[PDB]
Design a binder for this molecule. Structure first.
Ligand SMILES: OC[C@H]1CCN1c1nc(-c2cnn(C3CCNCC3)c2)cc(C(F)(F)F)n1
Ligand SMILES: OC[C@H]1CCN1c1nc(-c2cnn(C3CCNCC3)c2)cc(C(F)(F)F)n1
Lengths: 305, 298
């Protein structure tokens, strides 16, 4: 291969999770099975929750690194270039010898704005705990895990905890986790991290009707001292920490809503960033809603700050 | 290397393929079984098939330099397809499509991105050395321009002993009225069922009877009709038919038409009769429909 540069100790924010090639087509009308139609436009975009958050971290001004699986090939080359175009360190990518780099096909109806999605296959193995054990952690000041292969990720999280017990308080690595998909295996992740993000979608699937209901009803699952965070689209976001005080920020809707895809990852990355800079939970919550609301007014990530 | 090659002129497209269990209903989400990239486009797919059948062949179409064209070029070369005649553009992107292939019945849904890449022109064609080709196949698209290319082929043919004439075929695949003048050129004219049905015809037989009027004296009109096989009609006025050769499980019909046309060209180029070529075309297209992609049809 090649070489990478010196990363100062304790300098980077790491996001672990999915990166995917999304091929997004805008169409006149939903295509009938077995038809051949011409789209209005097509775009290839780098997507994935962890992947989107690393783009936002870089544009906020943080050194950031992505860890996730790819296979050699033209899909990965496209994704790697797109990561580097957004200033993201890809040295910790876990290259796989079996499977395909994830690629999804997203069909957007120009009539009604409906999205029809053929999601990537699951041929590529996820980063494992044994792959994680081989990573020197000292260059990272924060590690964010997108909940995916949870039993493996639990071991990574226990590895980080084991690291932090030996560290003086200023070399402790802060940890966050996101539980974004309503899948039962992910729920054990609530019990790890200093910050846990839970999605509106998961909260609803668990029967909660508001962010307030979700935080009060799930706080019992987090580890002692942790902050639980739940954004609720246009209703803004709440956070709840050990002091029992429910914090809220309203949303900051833009003049016109252009593109809400990735708004959730923008919020997550901006809360992480604000907390990593030493701000209070209430300040981070507000900043996260402001950056996410700005993003919803813009196509993609350009111009978000 | 004098009239020993088959040239196909038309599109080359990056086909980004997802193989699914079921075609997703509007506004839903389904996960695919597997993903791959394929070099596609009609003339391009026909080159793949000629190459697998062992015919030296060449492709000519527009490509824009880029990572995508590099994938496409590498694929052409792995199959031994000659790309020397490619019309490299400096304006436009390489066209690409999302192809959803239904694993259950081999249905294929194509969402094509036309990148306003400029077409191969009469003037590009002008620069081509016709002496290496025994057969030239043209995928109808930019009619008036291609008509010039066809006129150029005829003119070259006149200057030639019947021992060394270049056989020509034309495909009219898309139902655009612009293309209908192309029926008037070529030894072999391929008309698609989509075109035929668009012109009010309800079977290959009716279509061939209905459209034979429009081909040039001596030409063979060929109309494939998916699972119903294919029919042909030559100057003698006798209808010819071939049953299809359906695999017991149809898994991938993307490129079935192109396989059929290449196989028909290959067979005629080898001196087989029209009847035999039509059977061979259905045989290879049938074998293809039972496989993902093109490997293994021979
Ligand atoms: O996302 C993080 C939260 C914290 C503040 N974020 C915020 N999210 C959204 C947002 C997210 N998903 N959607 C879609 C829109 C179509 N219907 C389904 C929901 C809108 C809008 C705004 C707003 F515009 F309000 F500013 N802000
Ligand atoms: O294509 C050239 C023709 C001559 C013999 N070819 C042949 N084509 C097909 C074929 C083409 N499109 N479709 C779809 C199937 C779902 N409904 C819409 C049409 C099937 C199938 C077979 C068969 F399987 F029958 F062998 N053979």
């Amino acid at each position: 291969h090649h070489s990478s540069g010196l990363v100062p100790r304790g300098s980077q924010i790491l996001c672990v999770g999915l990166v995917v090639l999304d091929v997004i087509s805008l169409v006149d009308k939903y295509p009938k099975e077995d038809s051949e139609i011409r789209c209005l436009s097509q775009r290839w975009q780098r997507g994935g929750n962890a992947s989107n958050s690393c783009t936002v971290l870089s544009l906020l001004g943080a050194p950031c690194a992505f860890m996730g699986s790819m296979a050699p090939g033209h899909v990965a080359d496209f994704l790697v270039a797109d990561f580097r175009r957004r200033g993201v360190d890809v040295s910790q990518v876990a290259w796989q010898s079996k499977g395909d780099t994830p690629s999804s096909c997203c069909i957007i109806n120009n009539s009604n704005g409906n999205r029809t999605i053929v999601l990537h296959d699951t041929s590529l193995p996820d980063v494992s705990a044994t792959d994680f054990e081989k990573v020197d952690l000292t260059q990272f000041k924060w590690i964010h895990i997108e909940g995916r292969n949870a039993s493996e990720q639990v071991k990574m999280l226990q590895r980080i905890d084991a690291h932090n017990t030996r560290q003086p308080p200023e070399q402790k690595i802060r940890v966050s986790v996101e539980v974004e998909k309503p899948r039962e295996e992910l729920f054990q992740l609530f019990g790890y991290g200093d910050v846990v993000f839970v999605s509106k979608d998961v909260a609803k699937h668990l029967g909660f009707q508001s962010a307030e209901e979700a935080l009060r009803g799930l706080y019992g699952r987090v580890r002692k001292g942790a902050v639980l965070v739940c954004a609720w689209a246009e209703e803004g976001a709440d956070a709840l920490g050990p002091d029992g005080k429910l914090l809220h920020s309203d949303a900051f809707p833009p003049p016109r809503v252009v593109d809400t895809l990735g708004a959730g990852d923008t919020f997550n990355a901006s809360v992480i960033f604000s907390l990593s800079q030493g701000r209070s939970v209430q300040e981070a919550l507000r900043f996260g809603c402001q950056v996410a609301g700005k993003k919803c007014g813009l196509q993609g990530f350009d111009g978000i700050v």
